[PDB]
Short mmCIF file of N, CA and C and ligand atoms in Angstrom, two decimals:
data_model
loop_
_atom_site.label_atom_id
_atom_site.label_comp_id
_atom_site.label_asym_id
_atom_site.label_seq_id
_atom_site.Cartn_x
_atom_site.Cartn_y
_atom_site.Cartn_z
N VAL A 1 1.15 -1.22 -0.37
CA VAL A 1 -0.05 -0.06 -0.18
C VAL A 1 0.18 1.53 -0.48
N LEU A 2 0.45 2.18 -1.12
CA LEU A 2 0.96 3.62 -1.44
C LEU A 2 0.37 4.67 0.24
N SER A 3 1.55 4.38 0.37
CA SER A 3 0.75 6.46 0.91
C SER A 3 0.42 7.16 0.80
N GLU A 4 -0.29 8.64 1.66
CA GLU A 4 -0.78 9.59 0.75
C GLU A 4 0.68 10.55 -0.26
N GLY A 5 1.57 10.30 0.60
CA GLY A 5 2.95 10.93 0.32
C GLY A 5 3.39 10.27 -0.91
N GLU A 6 3.22 9.26 -1.26
CA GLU A 6 3.51 8.56 -2.40
C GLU A 6 2.81 9.00 -3.33
N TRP A 7 1.98 9.52 -3.23
CA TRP A 7 0.92 8.78 -4.48
C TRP A 7 1.03 10.01 -5.11
N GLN A 8 0.92 10.91 -3.83
CA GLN A 8 1.55 12.34 -3.99
C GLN A 8 2.29 12.51 -5.41
N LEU A 9 3.62 12.38 -4.72
CA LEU A 9 4.79 11.83 -5.11
C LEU A 9 4.79 11.61 -7.32
N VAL A 10 3.57 9.90 -7.49
CA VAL A 10 3.21 9.35 -8.72
C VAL A 10 2.68 10.42 -9.09
N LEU A 11 1.58 11.27 -8.64
CA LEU A 11 1.08 12.56 -9.71
C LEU A 11 1.78 13.69 -9.59
N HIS A 12 2.31 13.52 -8.82
CA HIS A 12 3.13 15.24 -8.80
C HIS A 12 4.46 15.29 -10.79
N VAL A 13 4.71 13.74 -10.71
CA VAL A 13 5.13 14.04 -11.89
C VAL A 13 4.39 13.59 -13.14
N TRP A 14 3.17 12.97 -12.74
CA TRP A 14 2.28 12.23 -13.90
C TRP A 14 1.27 13.53 -14.29
N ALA A 15 1.29 14.53 -13.82
CA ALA A 15 0.88 15.13 -14.45
C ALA A 15 1.89 16.19 -15.19
N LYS A 16 2.91 16.09 -15.42
CA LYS A 16 4.29 17.15 -16.27
C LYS A 16 3.73 15.85 -17.46
N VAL A 17 4.07 14.41 -17.31
CA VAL A 17 3.87 13.56 -18.45
C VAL A 17 1.81 14.23 -19.17
N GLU A 18 1.10 14.29 -18.57
CA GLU A 18 -0.11 14.77 -18.82
C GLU A 18 0.08 16.05 -20.29
N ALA A 19 1.54 16.31 -20.05
CA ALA A 19 2.00 17.75 -20.96
C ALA A 19 2.01 17.16 -22.19
N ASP A 20 2.41 16.63 -22.63
CA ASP A 20 3.00 15.52 -23.77
C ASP A 20 3.17 14.21 -23.81
N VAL A 21 1.40 12.95 -23.87
CA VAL A 21 1.61 12.06 -23.59
C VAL A 21 1.72 11.33 -24.59
N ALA A 22 1.62 12.00 -26.17
CA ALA A 22 2.13 11.56 -27.18
C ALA A 22 3.96 11.31 -27.73
N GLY A 23 4.37 11.98 -26.73
CA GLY A 23 5.68 12.32 -27.00
C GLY A 23 6.59 10.69 -25.68
N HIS A 24 5.95 10.64 -24.47
CA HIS A 24 6.27 9.82 -23.18
C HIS A 24 5.67 8.99 -24.29
N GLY A 25 4.92 8.56 -25.01
CA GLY A 25 3.89 7.19 -25.33
C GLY A 25 4.97 6.51 -25.89
N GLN A 26 5.88 7.54 -27.28
CA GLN A 26 6.55 6.39 -28.00
C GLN A 26 8.15 6.52 -26.67
N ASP A 27 8.52 6.97 -25.74
CA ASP A 27 10.17 7.12 -26.07
C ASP A 27 8.97 5.93 -25.33
N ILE A 28 8.45 5.49 -24.73
CA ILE A 28 8.69 4.61 -23.77
C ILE A 28 8.11 3.05 -24.39
N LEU A 29 7.72 3.51 -25.21
CA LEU A 29 7.53 1.64 -25.78
C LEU A 29 8.84 1.80 -27.62
N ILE A 30 9.28 3.03 -27.54
CA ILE A 30 10.29 2.38 -28.52
C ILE A 30 11.36 1.28 -27.15
N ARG A 31 12.03 2.37 -26.43
CA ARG A 31 13.08 2.32 -24.50
C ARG A 31 12.43 0.66 -24.75
N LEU A 32 11.26 0.10 -24.76
CA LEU A 32 11.15 -1.88 -24.62
C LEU A 32 11.36 -2.34 -25.61
N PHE A 33 10.52 -1.85 -26.89
CA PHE A 33 10.94 -2.63 -27.68
C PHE A 33 12.36 -2.62 -27.81
N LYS A 34 13.39 -1.83 -27.65
CA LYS A 34 14.95 -2.01 -28.15
C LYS A 34 15.33 -2.65 -26.69
N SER A 35 14.54 -2.25 -25.47
CA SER A 35 15.52 -2.93 -24.65
C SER A 35 15.39 -4.61 -24.81
N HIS A 36 14.00 -4.91 -24.71
CA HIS A 36 13.37 -5.92 -25.06
C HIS A 36 12.32 -6.57 -26.26
N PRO A 37 13.18 -7.24 -27.44
CA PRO A 37 12.30 -7.72 -29.09
C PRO A 37 11.61 -8.37 -28.92
N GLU A 38 11.83 -9.40 -27.74
CA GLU A 38 10.35 -10.18 -27.49
C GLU A 38 8.69 -9.07 -26.99
N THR A 39 9.55 -7.95 -26.84
CA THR A 39 8.13 -6.84 -26.65
C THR A 39 7.55 -6.87 -28.06
N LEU A 40 8.04 -7.24 -29.32
CA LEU A 40 7.48 -5.94 -29.94
C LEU A 40 7.56 -6.64 -30.98
N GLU A 41 7.27 -8.72 -30.67
CA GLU A 41 6.81 -9.34 -31.37
C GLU A 41 5.33 -10.22 -31.08
N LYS A 42 4.71 -8.84 -29.97
CA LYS A 42 4.02 -9.43 -29.78
C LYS A 42 2.38 -8.24 -30.07
N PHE A 43 3.04 -7.65 -31.10
CA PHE A 43 2.07 -6.41 -31.44
C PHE A 43 2.20 -6.62 -33.43
N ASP A 44 2.03 -7.70 -33.56
CA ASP A 44 1.06 -7.85 -35.50
C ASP A 44 1.18 -6.37 -35.99
N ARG A 45 0.60 -5.00 -34.91
CA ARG A 45 0.13 -3.79 -36.19
C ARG A 45 2.53 -3.50 -36.03
N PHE A 46 3.15 -4.28 -34.58
CA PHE A 46 4.50 -2.49 -35.24
C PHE A 46 5.59 -3.85 -35.42
N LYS A 47 5.11 -5.28 -35.61
CA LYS A 47 6.51 -6.34 -34.97
C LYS A 47 7.61 -5.22 -36.92
N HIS A 48 7.15 -5.52 -38.54
CA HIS A 48 6.90 -4.71 -39.34
C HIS A 48 8.76 -3.59 -39.21
N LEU A 49 8.44 -2.80 -37.58
CA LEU A 49 9.10 -1.72 -37.97
C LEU A 49 10.31 -2.60 -36.47
N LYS A 50 11.63 -2.30 -38.17
CA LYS A 50 12.29 -3.04 -37.07
C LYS A 50 13.94 -1.33 -37.60
N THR A 51 13.76 -0.93 -37.19
CA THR A 51 14.64 0.62 -36.56
C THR A 51 14.59 0.99 -35.61
N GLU A 52 14.89 1.67 -35.08
CA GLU A 52 14.61 3.27 -34.22
C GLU A 52 13.58 4.38 -34.91
N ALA A 53 14.34 4.79 -35.72
CA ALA A 53 14.35 5.29 -36.89
C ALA A 53 12.36 5.23 -37.37
N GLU A 54 12.08 4.32 -38.29
CA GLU A 54 11.46 3.64 -38.65
C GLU A 54 9.53 3.76 -37.14
N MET A 55 10.19 3.20 -35.91
CA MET A 55 9.57 3.57 -34.82
C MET A 55 9.41 5.27 -34.42
N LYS A 56 10.08 5.84 -34.42
CA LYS A 56 9.66 6.64 -34.30
C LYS A 56 8.95 8.14 -35.60
N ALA A 57 9.37 6.49 -36.60
CA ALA A 57 8.48 7.56 -37.44
C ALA A 57 6.84 6.91 -37.30
N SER A 58 6.54 5.47 -37.13
CA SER A 58 5.38 5.30 -36.49
C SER A 58 4.10 6.52 -35.99
N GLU A 59 3.32 6.95 -37.46
CA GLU A 59 1.98 6.94 -36.13
C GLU A 59 1.09 6.35 -36.06
N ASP A 60 1.38 5.27 -36.14
CA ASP A 60 0.18 3.52 -35.31
C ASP A 60 1.03 3.82 -33.74
N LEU A 61 2.31 4.04 -33.88
CA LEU A 61 2.79 3.25 -33.22
C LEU A 61 2.53 4.35 -31.97
N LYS A 62 2.48 5.51 -32.46
CA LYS A 62 2.60 6.56 -31.71
C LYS A 62 1.48 7.58 -31.08
N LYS A 63 -0.66 6.88 -31.92
CA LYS A 63 -1.34 6.43 -31.01
C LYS A 63 -1.44 6.04 -30.55
N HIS A 64 -0.84 4.00 -30.82
CA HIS A 64 -0.36 2.71 -29.37
C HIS A 64 -0.47 3.83 -28.05
N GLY A 65 1.04 4.73 -28.30
CA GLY A 65 1.64 5.18 -27.01
C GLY A 65 0.53 5.23 -26.00
N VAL A 66 -0.34 6.59 -26.75
CA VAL A 66 -1.10 7.60 -26.11
C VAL A 66 -2.48 6.64 -25.86
N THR A 67 -2.80 5.48 -26.68
CA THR A 67 -4.00 5.27 -25.21
C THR A 67 -3.22 4.48 -23.88
N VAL A 68 -2.13 3.63 -24.42
CA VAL A 68 -1.79 3.15 -22.50
C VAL A 68 -1.20 3.67 -21.96
N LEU A 69 -1.02 4.78 -21.98
CA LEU A 69 -0.47 5.79 -20.52
C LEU A 69 -1.84 6.09 -20.58
N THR A 70 -2.25 6.68 -21.67
CA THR A 70 -4.13 6.66 -21.25
C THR A 70 -4.77 6.04 -19.68
N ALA A 71 -4.57 5.56 -20.53
CA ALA A 71 -5.87 3.98 -19.68
C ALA A 71 -4.57 3.83 -18.32
N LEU A 72 -3.18 4.02 -18.44
CA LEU A 72 -2.03 4.26 -17.10
C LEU A 72 -2.18 4.89 -16.09
N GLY A 73 -2.79 6.42 -16.93
CA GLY A 73 -2.48 7.33 -16.15
C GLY A 73 -4.69 7.45 -15.02
N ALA A 74 -5.36 6.33 -15.84
CA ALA A 74 -6.66 7.03 -15.10
C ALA A 74 -6.43 5.36 -14.09
N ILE A 75 -5.77 4.50 -14.36
CA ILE A 75 -4.90 4.21 -13.23
C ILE A 75 -4.47 4.36 -12.12
N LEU A 76 -3.40 5.28 -12.12
CA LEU A 76 -2.27 5.62 -11.29
C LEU A 76 -3.50 6.82 -10.76
N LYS A 77 -4.08 7.90 -11.57
CA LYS A 77 -5.02 8.54 -10.66
C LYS A 77 -6.19 8.43 -9.76
N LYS A 78 -6.16 6.27 -9.74
CA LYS A 78 -7.52 6.01 -8.96
C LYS A 78 -6.93 5.73 -7.25
N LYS A 79 -5.29 5.32 -7.43
CA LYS A 79 -4.05 6.11 -6.01
C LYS A 79 -4.80 4.34 -5.08
N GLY A 80 -4.44 3.40 -6.52
CA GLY A 80 -4.71 2.48 -5.97
C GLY A 80 -6.58 1.62 -5.79
N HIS A 81 -7.31 2.41 -6.28
CA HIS A 81 -9.06 1.40 -5.65
C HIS A 81 -8.96 1.69 -7.73
N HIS A 82 -8.07 0.45 -8.21
CA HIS A 82 -7.67 0.92 -9.40
C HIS A 82 -8.97 -0.44 -10.06
N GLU A 83 -9.76 -1.37 -8.75
CA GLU A 83 -10.07 -2.62 -9.32
C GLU A 83 -11.15 -2.51 -10.90
N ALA A 84 -12.03 -1.99 -11.08
CA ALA A 84 -13.10 -1.29 -12.38
C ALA A 84 -12.18 -1.20 -13.36
N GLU A 85 -10.79 -0.34 -13.55
CA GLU A 85 -10.01 -0.17 -14.07
C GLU A 85 -9.55 -1.43 -14.67
N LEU A 86 -8.69 -2.56 -14.14
CA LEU A 86 -8.24 -3.10 -14.86
C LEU A 86 -8.49 -4.72 -15.27
N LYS A 87 -9.75 -4.58 -14.62
CA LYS A 87 -9.91 -5.41 -14.83
C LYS A 87 -10.34 -6.31 -16.58
N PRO A 88 -10.78 -5.22 -17.06
CA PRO A 88 -10.81 -5.56 -18.38
C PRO A 88 -9.08 -5.57 -19.31
N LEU A 89 -8.28 -4.78 -18.96
CA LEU A 89 -6.70 -4.38 -18.52
C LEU A 89 -6.37 -6.62 -18.76
N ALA A 90 -6.48 -6.43 -17.52
CA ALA A 90 -6.19 -7.65 -17.67
C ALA A 90 -6.09 -8.53 -17.92
N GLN A 91 -7.45 -9.19 -18.46
CA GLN A 91 -8.89 -9.69 -19.12
C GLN A 91 -7.95 -9.54 -20.66
N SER A 92 -7.73 -8.48 -21.11
CA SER A 92 -7.15 -8.75 -22.34
C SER A 92 -5.71 -8.58 -22.61
N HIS A 93 -5.28 -8.60 -21.70
CA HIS A 93 -3.63 -8.95 -21.59
C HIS A 93 -3.06 -10.23 -21.47
N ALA A 94 -4.18 -11.37 -20.56
CA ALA A 94 -3.91 -12.56 -20.66
C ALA A 94 -4.16 -13.44 -21.89
N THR A 95 -5.76 -12.18 -22.54
CA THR A 95 -6.42 -14.50 -23.03
C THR A 95 -6.24 -13.82 -23.98
N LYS A 96 -6.12 -12.44 -24.32
CA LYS A 96 -6.27 -12.51 -26.17
C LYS A 96 -5.06 -10.89 -27.01
N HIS A 97 -4.47 -11.00 -26.03
CA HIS A 97 -2.84 -10.36 -26.17
C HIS A 97 -1.66 -11.12 -25.97
N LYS A 98 -2.03 -12.12 -24.82
CA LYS A 98 -1.06 -13.31 -24.63
C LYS A 98 0.38 -12.63 -23.85
N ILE A 99 -0.62 -11.55 -21.96
CA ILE A 99 1.47 -10.62 -22.01
C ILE A 99 1.23 -11.26 -21.27
N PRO A 100 2.73 -11.60 -20.77
CA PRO A 100 3.37 -12.25 -19.17
C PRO A 100 3.76 -10.82 -18.76
N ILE A 101 3.35 -11.76 -17.14
CA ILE A 101 3.67 -10.42 -16.49
C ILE A 101 4.64 -9.55 -16.90
N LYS A 102 5.99 -10.46 -16.93
CA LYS A 102 7.36 -10.10 -16.32
C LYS A 102 7.80 -9.14 -17.84
N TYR A 103 6.47 -8.52 -19.03
CA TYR A 103 6.48 -7.95 -20.11
C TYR A 103 5.80 -6.57 -19.56
N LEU A 104 5.27 -6.52 -18.27
CA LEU A 104 4.25 -6.10 -17.25
C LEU A 104 5.90 -5.11 -17.28
N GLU A 105 6.97 -5.94 -16.35
CA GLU A 105 7.78 -5.59 -16.07
C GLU A 105 8.60 -4.81 -16.51
N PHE A 106 9.05 -5.66 -17.50
CA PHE A 106 8.71 -4.65 -18.78
C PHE A 106 9.11 -3.61 -19.16
N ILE A 107 7.51 -3.21 -19.18
CA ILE A 107 7.58 -1.77 -19.70
C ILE A 107 7.37 -1.03 -18.73
N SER A 108 7.15 -1.17 -17.38
CA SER A 108 7.40 -0.51 -16.17
C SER A 108 8.87 0.24 -15.43
N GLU A 109 9.81 -0.64 -16.53
CA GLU A 109 11.14 -0.41 -15.79
C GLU A 109 11.74 0.68 -17.12
N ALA A 110 11.23 1.01 -18.49
CA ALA A 110 10.73 1.65 -19.44
C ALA A 110 10.77 3.40 -18.96
N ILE A 111 8.97 3.51 -18.52
CA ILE A 111 8.12 4.47 -17.97
C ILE A 111 9.49 4.96 -17.20
N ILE A 112 10.18 4.00 -16.58
CA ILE A 112 10.32 4.78 -15.11
C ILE A 112 11.77 5.39 -15.65
N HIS A 113 12.27 4.51 -16.78
CA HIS A 113 13.37 4.64 -17.46
C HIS A 113 12.84 7.03 -18.41
N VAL A 114 12.45 6.86 -18.48
CA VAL A 114 11.94 8.04 -19.80
C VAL A 114 11.62 9.20 -18.83
N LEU A 115 10.41 8.40 -17.65
CA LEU A 115 10.20 9.46 -16.35
C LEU A 115 11.39 10.05 -16.31
N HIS A 116 12.25 9.48 -15.24
CA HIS A 116 13.78 10.24 -15.67
C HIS A 116 14.17 11.27 -16.08
N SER A 117 14.51 11.40 -17.58
CA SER A 117 15.46 11.56 -18.57
C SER A 117 13.81 12.81 -19.27
N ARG A 118 13.00 12.53 -18.60
CA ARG A 118 12.00 14.23 -19.09
C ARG A 118 11.55 14.71 -18.10
N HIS A 119 12.12 14.21 -16.65
CA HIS A 119 11.23 15.22 -15.36
C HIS A 119 12.25 14.98 -14.75
N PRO A 120 13.42 15.45 -14.44
CA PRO A 120 14.08 14.45 -13.36
C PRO A 120 14.28 15.54 -12.33
N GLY A 121 13.71 16.93 -11.77
CA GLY A 121 13.56 18.02 -10.62
C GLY A 121 12.51 17.33 -10.40
N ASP A 122 11.40 16.48 -11.27
CA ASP A 122 9.91 16.10 -10.82
C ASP A 122 10.13 14.72 -9.98
N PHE A 123 11.06 14.17 -10.86
CA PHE A 123 11.93 12.80 -10.42
C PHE A 123 13.04 12.62 -9.87
N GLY A 124 13.28 12.59 -8.97
CA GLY A 124 14.61 12.77 -8.16
C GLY A 124 14.06 11.19 -7.24
N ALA A 125 14.92 10.33 -5.78
CA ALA A 125 14.78 9.64 -5.90
C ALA A 125 13.35 8.84 -4.89
N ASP A 126 12.67 10.25 -4.26
CA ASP A 126 11.65 9.59 -3.80
C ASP A 126 10.73 9.12 -4.35
N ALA A 127 10.26 10.50 -5.82
CA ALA A 127 9.25 10.07 -6.63
C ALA A 127 9.80 8.36 -7.47
N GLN A 128 11.10 8.28 -7.77
CA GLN A 128 11.94 6.67 -7.91
C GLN A 128 10.74 6.18 -7.47
N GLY A 129 11.17 6.01 -6.18
CA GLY A 129 11.03 4.55 -5.28
C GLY A 129 9.19 4.77 -5.37
N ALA A 130 8.12 5.86 -4.83
CA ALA A 130 7.10 6.01 -5.36
C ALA A 130 6.57 5.32 -6.57
N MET A 131 7.02 5.65 -7.50
CA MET A 131 5.94 5.80 -8.75
C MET A 131 6.93 4.40 -9.26
N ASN A 132 8.18 3.28 -8.71
CA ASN A 132 7.89 1.55 -9.00
C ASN A 132 7.00 1.86 -8.07
N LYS A 133 6.86 1.58 -6.77
CA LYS A 133 5.58 0.63 -5.51
C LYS A 133 4.32 1.24 -5.81
N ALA A 134 4.48 1.96 -7.25
CA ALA A 134 3.19 2.47 -7.93
C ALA A 134 2.84 1.17 -8.95
N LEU A 135 3.92 1.07 -9.28
CA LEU A 135 3.62 -0.01 -10.83
C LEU A 135 3.95 -1.71 -10.23
N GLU A 136 5.25 -1.58 -8.96
CA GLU A 136 4.51 -2.62 -8.37
C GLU A 136 3.15 -2.88 -8.11
N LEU A 137 2.34 -2.75 -7.64
CA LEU A 137 1.03 -2.28 -7.32
C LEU A 137 -0.20 -2.82 -8.75
N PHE A 138 0.68 -2.36 -9.69
CA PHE A 138 -0.21 -2.97 -10.96
C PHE A 138 -0.49 -3.38 -11.31
N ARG A 139 1.09 -4.08 -11.10
CA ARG A 139 1.44 -5.34 -11.32
C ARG A 139 0.80 -6.08 -10.01
N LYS A 140 0.67 -6.37 -9.51
CA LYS A 140 0.40 -7.58 -8.35
C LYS A 140 -0.80 -7.09 -8.70
N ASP A 141 -1.93 -6.26 -8.28
CA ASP A 141 -3.03 -6.50 -9.28
C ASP A 141 -3.48 -7.36 -10.81
N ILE A 142 -2.89 -6.90 -11.23
CA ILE A 142 -2.85 -7.09 -12.61
C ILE A 142 -2.61 -8.65 -11.88
N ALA A 143 -1.54 -8.88 -12.19
CA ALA A 143 -0.81 -10.87 -11.69
C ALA A 143 -2.11 -11.69 -11.13
N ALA A 144 -2.63 -10.81 -9.98
CA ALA A 144 -3.73 -11.55 -9.28
C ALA A 144 -4.98 -12.53 -9.83
N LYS A 145 -5.63 -11.36 -11.44
CA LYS A 145 -6.04 -11.63 -12.08
C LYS A 145 -5.63 -12.57 -13.07
N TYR A 146 -4.65 -12.51 -13.72
CA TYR A 146 -3.62 -14.04 -14.65
C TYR A 146 -4.27 -15.00 -13.76
N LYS A 147 -3.69 -15.14 -12.90
CA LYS A 147 -3.45 -16.71 -12.04
C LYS A 147 -5.53 -16.45 -12.28
N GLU A 148 -6.59 -16.02 -11.43
CA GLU A 148 -7.68 -16.78 -11.55
C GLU A 148 -8.06 -16.92 -13.18
N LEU A 149 -7.76 -16.40 -13.51
CA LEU A 149 -7.73 -17.00 -15.54
C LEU A 149 -6.56 -18.19 -15.98
N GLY A 150 -5.67 -18.52 -15.16
CA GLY A 150 -4.92 -19.27 -15.41
C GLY A 150 -3.28 -19.03 -16.75
N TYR A 151 -3.40 -17.82 -16.48
CA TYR A 151 -2.54 -17.27 -17.17
C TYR A 151 -0.66 -16.66 -16.73
C1 LIG B 201 1.72 0.40 -18.19
C2 LIG B 201 1.09 -1.38 -19.42
C3 LIG B 201 -0.31 -1.65 -19.92
C4 LIG B 201 -1.14 -0.67 -20.74
C5 LIG B 201 -1.25 0.47 -19.38
C6 LIG B 201 -1.99 -0.94 -21.65
C7 LIG B 201 -3.32 -0.47 -22.07
C8 LIG B 201 -2.94 -0.81 -23.40
C9 LIG B 201 -4.77 -0.86 -23.68
C10 LIG B 201 -5.63 -0.03 -23.63
C11 LIG B 201 -5.31 -1.85 -25.35
C12 LIG B 201 -6.12 -1.36 -25.38
C13 LIG B 201 -7.48 -2.24 -25.49
C14 LIG B 201 -6.83 -3.36 -24.87
O1 LIG B 201 -6.88 -4.03 -25.71
O2 LIG B 201 -7.17 -3.79 -23.78
C15 LIG B 201 -3.83 -2.49 -25.28
C16 LIG B 201 -3.72 -2.96 -26.11
C17 LIG B 201 -2.61 -4.29 -26.17
N1 LIG B 201 -1.57 -4.35 -24.99
FE1 LIG B 201 -1.77 -3.18 -23.76
N2 LIG B 201 -0.84 -1.62 -22.20
C18 LIG B 201 -0.30 -2.32 -21.35
C19 LIG B 201 1.07 -3.38 -21.70
C20 LIG B 201 1.62 -3.79 -23.01
C21 LIG B 201 2.07 -4.52 -22.64
C22 LIG B 201 4.09 -4.08 -22.05
C23 LIG B 201 2.34 -5.13 -24.58
C24 LIG B 201 3.56 -6.35 -25.17
C25 LIG B 201 4.33 -5.96 -24.28
C26 LIG B 201 0.76 -4.86 -24.02
C27 LIG B 201 0.76 -4.93 -25.58
C28 LIG B 201 -1.18 -4.81 -25.92
C29 LIG B 201 -0.94 -5.52 -27.31
C30 LIG B 201 -0.21 -6.90 -28.21
C31 LIG B 201 -2.33 -4.83 -27.97
C32 LIG B 201 -3.79 -4.93 -29.00
C33 LIG B 201 -2.58 -3.63 -29.87
C34 LIG B 201 -3.64 -3.73 -30.99
O3 LIG B 201 -4.53 -3.48 -31.72
O4 LIG B 201 -2.94 -4.72 -31.82
N3 LIG B 201 0.11 -4.07 -23.15
N4 LIG B 201 -2.53 -2.26 -24.35
O1 LIG B 202 0.97 -2.03 -25.29
O2 LIG B 202 -0.43 -1.62 -24.43
#
């Protein structure tokens, strides 16, 4: 359980993200795909992309980044009371998209990296630890739903 102070740190940096949702989504997905190429293979939409330049030039990828971060933002603003938001997400990612929890660990690492690059004065150690905890909570709760479903 995050404390109120931890959530304040999370949402303070998140408010900085929401000034440029699409730029952040690009950086995060590209980082994910480059650091963990098995993740790219899960996207029939995107597996044709073979270079970083090609990824950066894809408007479809940029749009999907907005989808991802919009969903995450809605989850983070619920401060843990996010059951209703995670049910559909867990159900699609387990059963349709076939995404292992480990790959949620990978995108969490990419999120934290990009936040540090883009917002260092609002992403000091205190805020990094709080964001790590928020993304851990996200993963914990998705993992429980996966387990229910047999994934
Ligand atoms: C912060 C973590 C993530 C969030 C908030 C998130 C959110 C979403 C949302 C809102 C959608 C569209 C609605 C749906 O199908 O449920 C989607 C689609 C998808 N997600 Fe994620 N996602 C996350 C992580 C991942 C990861 C790590 C992978 C792959 C490694 C992944 C693979 C997919 C795929 C394959 C689709 C369908 C793309 C398409 O239109 O073809 N997601 N995700
Ligand atoms: O990727 O969602």
